[PDB]
C-alpha cells in the first residue's frame, strides 16, 4: 500500500528478471534498467557531487505499464550505476503512473516535480485521464517522499505534462507540454516563489503546422545569447527528409526575457536525423556545459530486446553550442573517452568497386572515420557495421553521392525495423563520422557536431565485424581510428 | 578481299555462333545481331514501305572489333528480322570500321553515310586514326557498294565522326560530331547539293562545360516551332542525379533557320535516367511521328551476355514530341500493342508493410503500373520485377518518399551491375509507370512521358515472377495492367 512497499515489491520483480537477461542487445555503455521496460529520461541533475539520471520505467515486464521511475547515478556522465526505483504509483493524483519531470536543489532537498498519471475512463485512444504536476522530495538521494499535487491545468485541459523547471530571478519557472482546446500543442510557462503554488504566465510557443495536437517533455535554456526550446512534437507528418520517426524531437533557437514572447530567431529543427531519438532532456554539468539526453527509442518500433525480458536505452550524454548562424553543434561528451581501450589506427585506405573486412570487433567500439569527398566518387562508399563475417547482415553508413547525403540503412542489421534515415553531405572537403556502437545502437555525430543519426540494431550474428566498401566508384578513407569501449558497470 | 568475300566471312561467321546462343538473357522483342557484338543504331530510315535499322556490328565474337554494319527490318518498327550485314570494313579510309552515319533517300537509291576509321598508330588510348566521312548506295535495299570519302576533317581534327544527313531547300545539311583544336566537344554543320561535294557551314553547338571532350551521334532535326539536338556528350562530371553513366545521351531545343546561329531556349537535359542509353538516332515515320532508337547499353559495363557468345541491344522506339515547356514527351510506340498476349487486369491493391507475389511471369511482359502518391506513404513502394520465386534476386522499382523519387535499384538483379537510378516523381496525384521488361532489360515510362529509366538486369533465376511491397507505411495501386509480351521474329 505504502509507497516504501511498492517500490521494494517493483525492486524485486526488477532484480528476479535480470536473470533472463540476454547480452546480445543489452548495451555495455548506455543506460538500460537491470530488466523490465524504460522510456523518456527524467529528473536529469548534477547535485551533491553525483550526476543522476531518472527514466520513466514499468518495473513488472518488459512492455510499458504503471510508470516508476527508475534511477542510476554517475560521478562522471559515464560509469552509471542502477540505483533503487526513486518513485511508484501510489496516490489518487499519480496511481496510473509517475510520468516525466525534473529535479531542482530546493535549498539542499533534491526535489523530483513530475506529472502525476489517472485513467478516469478506459476507452483506448478515446481514454479519459487526468494529469496534474506533483512534488516529491529526498533527503539521501535513494529514497523520496511524495508532497503531493503543486499544479492543475485549467477546466477542458487533459494532456498536461513533462514538467521541466529552473531557478531565474528569485522564482521558479515551469514548462510542462499541452493539448490546448483547439486541439494545438502548446508549451505553458508558469512561475511559483516557493515551488508549491503556481501562477500561469504566458503561452511559451506553439507550432505553425495547425495538425501538431501535443508537444511532449519541453525543456527552456539559455545558451550563447539565446533561449532554446527543445521538445517533441506529435502530428507533424514525415516530408521528404523531414520527420521520419512515428513522433519529433527537436530545438527552436529565439530570444527571451520574463515579461517578453519567446521571440523565434530559428525555427523548429530535429535534434537527430536517426530512428530512434525521443524525449529530450537537458541539465547543466558541473563544468557549466549543457548536457542532453534521450531515450534511444521510438513509440511503436518493433522492440526485439523484449523477447529478453528488457526494453529502452538512453542516448549517449551530448554537449549542445550554438553556432554563429544559431543552430546547435551536438557532440558526445568527453569523459567517454574514459571507456577507451585497444585504441587501432588506419591511416590512406583506398577501395574502387570493392569490399574489405576491416577485422575489427563491432559489438561495443568507437570509431572516428574521416572521408575525401571530393575523391570519393563511388555512387555508394563507406562502412558495414555490426556486420557478420559473412557480409550478409551489416548496418550500412556510407555516402550517396547521388543524394549527396550520408545514409544510415538497417535494412540488413538482423532483427526489427528496415530503411534508412540520412543527413546532407555538410560543405566542407571532408566528411568526419564519429560512430558509437553498441550491443543493439549506432550514433553518428557528422563533422563538428553539424548533425547526428542514432538508430537502434539487433543483429543476430554471433561476431560483428566491419567493412568498407566503394561501389560504381572510389573511397578515400583519410583516417579510421578504432577503440574497443569498456563495460561502464564493471 | 572485296567488300561481298568479307561480308559472306562475317554472315558465316555470325551464323556458326549463333547456335551458342543461350535464351536467358536474348531479348525477344529487342534488336540484337544473331550472335557477336553491336552498338550504337546508325541508318535509320523509312525506305521503300519498310523501317531499316542498322548498328555497329562486330561479328566474329561478342566484344567490340573490326565494325561491320548490320541490319534489321520491318513493315511496322516491331516486327524486326534479321538481315545479311551491309557494310564490312574494305578499303584505306574504313580498314579498322564502318563507324556510324545515317541514311537517307537520293532520289530512289538508299544512301549510307557512315565514318570511315583506320588506325594510323596503335597507343591504347593515345592513338591516333583518321576520321572521315563516306558513302556507300544499294538498289535493293541488302546490298551496298561503297564510293569513297565524302568528308574530310580540317588538319588538326582526328575526332570527326557520326554523320546524319537531310534534305532541306534543295540541299543536303550534314552535322558531325568533333573534338576541336582546343579539345572541347562540338558539333559542326555542313552543307552539299550532290552529296559528294560538302562544305563547313557553321558551328552549330558547343556546351558551356568545357571537360565536354566529344559530342558524339549528333541528329539536328525539327519539332514543333523548334529545332532539336541529340546527342551523346562525353567528359560531363557526374553531379548528384545528373549524368551518372559513364558517357551521356540527351537533348538541346532552341531556334534556327539556315543562315542563323542555333539559340538554344532549353539546355542540355538527358535523354534518359536509367543505366543503359546511349548513341540515340531519329527517323520520321510513315505517318510523321519522330522516332528515336539508342543502344540500351554504356561503355566499360559489365556484359554477362558475353559468356553466351553476344553483346547489344537496341532500346524500343520511342515517339518524341514537345511539351508546352519545350521539354521532350517520350513515350513507347503504338505498334508495340501489337506483341501483347495474355492481358491480366488487377485494380485497387493496398499493401502495408508487406510483400504479395502476384505471380505473374516476368521473362518478357509489359506492366501499366498506376501509383496514388497522396496516399502511398511508405518510406519505400513499388514492385520487385524480373524476381527469383523467393524474393532474394530482383528489380526494384518503387517510390521514395524520403527522396521523393522513383527508384530504380538493381543491387539484387543477378549478374554484373549494381546501384540505383531515379527520377523526380512527377507534379501529379498519380504514378503512371508504364514497364517493359525482356530478358535482360527494364524500360520505365513515366507519367505521359515526362521522364524515362532504361538499365540492362541479368537475372539468374529459373523463374522470373513479380512482386509488390510496402515498407514503413502503405503502397496504393489504383490498377496494374499487365500482358506477357510475345517473340517479335515469331
Ligand atoms: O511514460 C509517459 C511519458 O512519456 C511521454 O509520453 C513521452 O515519451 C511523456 O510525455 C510522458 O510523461
Ligand atoms: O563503334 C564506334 C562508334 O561508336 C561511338 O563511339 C558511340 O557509341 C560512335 O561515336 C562511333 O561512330
Redesign the interface.
Known sequence: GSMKNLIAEANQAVEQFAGQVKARYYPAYHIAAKSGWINDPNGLIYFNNQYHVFFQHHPYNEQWGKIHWGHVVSDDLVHWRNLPIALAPSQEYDKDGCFSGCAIDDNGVLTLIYTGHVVLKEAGDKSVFKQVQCLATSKDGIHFEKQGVIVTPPEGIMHFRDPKVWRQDDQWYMVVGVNDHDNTGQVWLYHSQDLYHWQFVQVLAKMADPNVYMLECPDFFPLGDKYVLTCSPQGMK?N??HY?NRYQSGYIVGDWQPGSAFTITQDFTELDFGHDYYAPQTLISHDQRRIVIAWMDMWDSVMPSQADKWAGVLTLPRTLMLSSNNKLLINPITELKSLRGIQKKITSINLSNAIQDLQLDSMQCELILKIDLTNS?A??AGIALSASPDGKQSTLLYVD????RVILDRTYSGEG????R?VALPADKFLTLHIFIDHSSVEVFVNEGQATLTSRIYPTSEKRTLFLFA??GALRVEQLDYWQIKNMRG
Chains 1, 2 share one sequence.
Not at 553521392?401 to 549527396?404: G, K, R
Not at 525495423?417 to 534508412?420: A, E, I, L, Q, T
Open positions: 514525415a521528404g527528409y521520419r566518387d555512387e555508394r553521392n547521388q543524394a549527396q525495423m528496415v530503411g534508412y540520412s561501389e560504381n
